[PDB]
Amino acid sequence: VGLQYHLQIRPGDVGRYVIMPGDPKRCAKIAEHFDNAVLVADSREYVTYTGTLNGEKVSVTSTGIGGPSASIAMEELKLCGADTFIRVGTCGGIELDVKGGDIVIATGAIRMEGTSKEYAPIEFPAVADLEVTNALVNAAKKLGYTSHAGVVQCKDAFYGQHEPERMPVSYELLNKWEAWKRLGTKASEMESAALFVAASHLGVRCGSDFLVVGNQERNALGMDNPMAHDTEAAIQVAVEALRTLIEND
Amino acid sequence: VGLQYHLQIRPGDVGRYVIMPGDPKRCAKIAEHFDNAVLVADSREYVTYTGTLNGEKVSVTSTGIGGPSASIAMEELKLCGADTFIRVGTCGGIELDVKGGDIVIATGAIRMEGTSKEYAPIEFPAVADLEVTNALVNAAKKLGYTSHAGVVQCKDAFYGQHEPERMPVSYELLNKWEAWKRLGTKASEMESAALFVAASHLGVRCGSDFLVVGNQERNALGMDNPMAHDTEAAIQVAVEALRTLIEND
Amino acid sequence: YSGEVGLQYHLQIRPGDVGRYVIMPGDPKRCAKIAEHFDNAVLVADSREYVTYTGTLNGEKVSVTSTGIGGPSASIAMEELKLCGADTFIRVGTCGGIELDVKGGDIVIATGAIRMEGTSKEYAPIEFPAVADLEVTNALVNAAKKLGYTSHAGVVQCKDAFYGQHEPERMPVSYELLNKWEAWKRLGTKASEMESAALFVAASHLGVRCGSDFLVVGNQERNALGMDNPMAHDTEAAIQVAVEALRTLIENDK
Amino acid sequence: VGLQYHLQIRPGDVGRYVIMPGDPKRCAKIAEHFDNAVLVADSREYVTYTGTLNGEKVSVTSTGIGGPSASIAMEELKLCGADTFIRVGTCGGIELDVKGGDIVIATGAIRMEGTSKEYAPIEFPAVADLEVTNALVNAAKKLGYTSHAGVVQCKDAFYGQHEPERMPVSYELLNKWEAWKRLGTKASEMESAALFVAASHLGVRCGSDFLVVGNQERNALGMDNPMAHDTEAAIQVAVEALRTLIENDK
Amino acid sequence: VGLQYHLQIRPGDVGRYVIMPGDPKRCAKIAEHFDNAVLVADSREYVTYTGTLNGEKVSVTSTGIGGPSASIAMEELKLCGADTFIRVGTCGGIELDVKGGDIVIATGAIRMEGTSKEYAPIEFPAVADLEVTNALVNAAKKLGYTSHAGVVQCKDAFYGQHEPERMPVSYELLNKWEAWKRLGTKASEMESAALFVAASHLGVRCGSDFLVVGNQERNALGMDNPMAHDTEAAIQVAVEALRTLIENDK
Amino acid sequence: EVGLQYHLQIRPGDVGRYVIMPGDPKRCAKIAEHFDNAVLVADSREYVTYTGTLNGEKVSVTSTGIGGPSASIAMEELKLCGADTFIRVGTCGGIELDVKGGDIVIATGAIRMEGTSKEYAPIEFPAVADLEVTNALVNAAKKLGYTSHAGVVQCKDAFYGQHEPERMPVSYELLNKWEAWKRLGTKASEMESAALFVAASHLGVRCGSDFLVVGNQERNALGMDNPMAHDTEAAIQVAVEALRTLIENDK
Ligand SMILES: O=P(O)(O)O[C@H]1O[C@H](CO)[C@@H](O)[C@H]1O
Ligand SMILES: O=P(O)(O)O[C@H]1O[C@H](CO)[C@@H](O)[C@H]1O
Ligand SMILES: O=P(O)(O)O[C@H]1O[C@H](CO)[C@@H](O)[C@H]1O
Ligand SMILES: O=P(O)(O)O[C@H]1O[C@H](CO)[C@@H](O)[C@H]1O
Ligand SMILES: O=P(O)(O)O[C@H]1O[C@H](CO)[C@@H](O)[C@H]1O
Ligand SMILES: O=P(O)(O)O[C@H]1O[C@H](CO)[C@@H](O)[C@H]1O
Ligand SMILES: O=c1cc[nH]c(=O)[nH]1
């Protein structure tokens, strides 16, 4: 294995454990939670920092928006030695109890996107690794953060989530959205389906937690809908979960 | 709510916790693990016994083979007050490490069947309830049984699994089978996809464990292929998991 | 899996246990009732949801084996019966009327089935029609006429989710179920049941003859319009039609 | 109802019973089997002759190749009063027993085409009317022609049937072809799926019989593969079937 | 390569450039635009005329209605040496600016039909050849005809376009129709999707222009809806485009 | 009214009606050098935006990142801010054997083997490039003297599905479809045009695309000379020249 084309990393540049935010600008924020983390690469939408946690090498690499760029990151990180991943992002609540400021931990994801379909037949479930999921749930409890563990909807079109009525395929998006609501779906985001399915194929462990920035369903009902933007809580949960996974390994 | 057409049960007949084997003949065997279990109903392929565990009312109801009959059981049990379900069945191993005699615990299921598609869009994941899954995993470790926690393939055609080459759609079955193998799938069975998706819709908790009867992949490679038919171990794991869920209620 | 040559894993039958002609109800409890129509029938196997009785009709060996609810269990029955020598099958069940002329008490004979289920898709590409054998269908139609029972020969809708038929509005995929239901109504569909699609398609692949008749238990569409909707539960009439059809097929095969 | 745009026919121009060949040039041939048939219209690929059989008004209208043109014919004939249709065409054998010269009677059809999908969800079976099918089977028996009653494969791409290996989607066509063989499919043609499904929606009776022109599967195995082109036999069976259907309606 | 089964043509009978109308009766009208056109064949719904344009051999062959019959025509013409095709038909407008009498030039087509799916995976775009499309656009401008260059919707069920509400799959047809409207679709017809995709596989150039016969969407909104039937303009544009292509190919 | 865009962090007035869109945010500065007095407008997430002028007209360059999901977001937000003419400038892997490293590919349409476009339009709708933009690109390539190939390009969501399909659980599907693309005259493989073309059809804007061929796996499989390329200057020059004539034609 040599220099990776998209991420510009080589074997030895990253740890076995990696946190993956969508926004490259969030990597520095996350790296602050690691020990002696330095920037290893900044290529395209991929910023990578590597430091340590409990003395073990760990990294944080952005994926950009969408399963296409996210799967490229997992593939190249895996080739360089990574085997445990935790996506840390933002999401829009669906379930009425999921409010801005809360944390969502994905147990699985709705594969309404194309990247996963180029990895596995659609019938295969996008499911998060059990160990990573439990580590996240336990971390949130220990830190005292309100959390929701459940399925999250993934999609390829961000504007299909907030303006489905305008789309040529509005009927499809609207019908499926009601379906997600009737299935107990917690929130909506964009990268977990691709990461979970790719992880199943690559044989690595992957989980995800998110900061709920708001809830459109609560808004439509006129219910109080506080907005949030600071991902610190979600980051703290992911880092504590990593410490747990590292020690258990 | 009154008398259920298919199961012939009514509110009060069953507990909130129900174990669900596929074979009606297995209900009596499972009922022996409960305290003072009595036969409640014997309608069609649905045999139901209700007793107590740790003083809480519990039941066991057969689903028959297939998502169609299994979904009916969950629907009617739910209408009568059931809200926590654990399927206990048999399966065929895929992953080479999954041998006859071992126990498999489904974290999710491949929706290669039609029942779940009449409940949810195919993109939705058939995922087991986190609490039930952890209860099963812990029970298996406590009892010292070799277990495998992962995704199981569900299907509608049993003979499509064992005689794919002869089917008109052999090409599709064989292609998908290789796909399941490359996705770390643990074993193959038939009811979890329907039960998991139906559960997501109904708002109830559902999990599954199975006795591995054999492994066709090991057989195809000329490897050891011990056969097993006694589901006592899978049943013990399910009963202990139920006890845990009852305690943590 | 069965540990013995010829022993069928699920049905627990062996070559010699069943005749070439088999009636297939969904409910295992209905087998005894059907067996009474044969001469000297005896139970040969009772495994899982599969109860099998064998006797004779006009001196020819015949059987009745339950399939349980759904294409998954029904396909297993046909596969294992076929391996034991069966080659002519007639499903006898219950169905819910769709066409407004299909009333409770009437008999429906399936000429084909709507493949809105997954079992048939694991046998054949969805484009292939789930169509009943011509000889069996004609035998059923002629038997109902001879016996004087009002019948309707046409397409039946098959499905995997019973509760999707009666509670579609509640389903996450309600939009799909409701839209397709309107399509079935506009295509002259007679009634709704669950096993014929799987049985007809498997039969086409296995090279055996299969047909189906059903007792109409009611009609939801007539009920929705406020039209008289008499309910029914006794499958005796449907059974009589099936047994008479078997007599016809047995004699014609000679 | 007035003048139909594509067929250029109006109520009264056609009978309740119509035979439908694919080739417009085959209409004159079929018309000879009726009594005092006259040319009614010649529009696009649609030629229509109307005459009588047993004193009842009957017609023959070509459909052209494919479900798109055939469905237009059924829709417009239906609007003008037609309610019983029998397609008479040619087909290529699949089943090894189906040889050139033989007649095939479609009990149903494989919907591997797009026209039917714009009428009904793909799960709906393309199934021929019981009465018409029995009439055809009884006619073939009475006339003494070797016939095969079973499912036929329909398709939209003729060259996908004969040159599948060359197609970009060769893998799909070849795989499905093997599936049709393993399902007992009798032969391959192109219009029945569209006509059967449309008939189910329109509430009319439709059936089909064909002249087997050859069998590629027999040719692939080096078996004797007689070639045929005279649709006379298939036509005689369809006309005899129309005759008994007419008598039964009386 | 010998006699083609369906079109009844053989190498040498047609030029490299072919105009393809849907109606066999329109071939004679189009042939008048060529120099010294001769009737080469009249088989089934396929009428073929061959003459010259600027001294170069060119032909006109009807396709009948639908992708199935049109694909057969392209396949057989191609085997006989044709490599540049221009479909000339009629269409119903969708885009509110597309009025009866106007000319529509297809830059691509919506594959809501089955023929193309037997040639290519549905994801592949039905796109017209750039050179042919530019020749058509420039020709329309030169001749002074109002034209619209864009995507056209293809379908297999003509009656699904005008009577969607009645169809068993009305919900699907209606939803998709609204989608086509929100994607700037110019008009609706039936053969371009099949021809464009088949052309991509066969390695030939294909384009299409149509006479707008009316606009149902304008009518639905109560807007002036002038209707037309004379394809003379659409034919002139295609013939002028052929002259351009012929000269540029030199 | 339209305000600050969440993802791109731009507002009405920040960008011109004409925008060039590379996939790599790092390629924006290089493209901007082709404009007059370009200045950085925003740098948010994978979206870097520069705005300057070309022949007096305001023009911009904004990166899309990899994939239709990020690309569609860029088009949506740029459109809201007033952009109506887009030209993607990227890199691609050749398929047709005549498409080799260094050449320029101009997409006339795209294979929708990705999910973003499906959340915009039914799959039957063609992903087709705007006629004016495509012609402008073709004319520019000829004028500048660069070898170019105008045709259909394959779009996908999984980069590693293109380069190691044999490994994938769905290898059978990827491999079969790849042969189909080869038999349909497909020129090259990339990732964002399908989403951009379809979104443009819906939004009512003009979109085209040109790419630098960086390699050709099919040529390599046959042992043919397979030179690698990475300098996008040529593809950029063609896009800028196309923008220039499009601007002139609109005036
Ligand atoms: O904030 P990140 O980590 O990018 O995640 C969320 O943000 C983007 C949508 O704004 C998508 O990536 C979504 O999943
Ligand atoms: O033994 P059970 O519980 O029936 O489970 C397995 O057994 C049957 C297949 O033999 C299917 O039900 C499968 O899921
Ligand atoms: O009464 P049977 O024979 O079971 O048939 C009908 O009854 C069941 C539904 O209640 C399904 O099997 C349906 O097809
Ligand atoms: O000869 P006809 O009646 O046209 O039928 C067959 O002939 C054509 C194919 O050559 C298709 O129409 C096919 O169904
Ligand atoms: O007039 P033509 O060329 O046949 O084209 C149109 O006419 C027919 C529909 O009336 C279809 O072929 C449609 O595409
Ligand atoms: O180099 P860009 O412009 O990103 O384009 C190509 O590069 C990436 C793949 O390496 C994808 O974006 C593909 O479309
Ligand atoms: O609503 C939201 C919020 C964050 N990310 C999303 O994808 N959707």
Ligand SMILES: O=c1cc[nH]c(=O)[nH]1
């Ligand atoms: O192989 C097997 C064994 C048990 N149950 C199944 O469904 N498959």
Ligand SMILES: O=c1cc[nH]c(=O)[nH]1
């Ligand atoms: O309504 C009914 C009645 C019997 N069986 C069914 O499947 N549905």
Ligand SMILES: O=c1cc[nH]c(=O)[nH]1
């Ligand atoms: O092989 C054949 C012969 C006639 N018609 C067809 O469609 N196929």
Ligand SMILES: O=c1cc[nH]c(=O)[nH]1
């Ligand atoms: O509306 C129309 C007019 C002509 N051709 C069509 O296909 N549709």
Ligand SMILES: O=c1cc[nH]c(=O)[nH]1
């Ligand atoms: O092979 C390649 C090269 C560049 N971009 C792609 O998407 N694929």
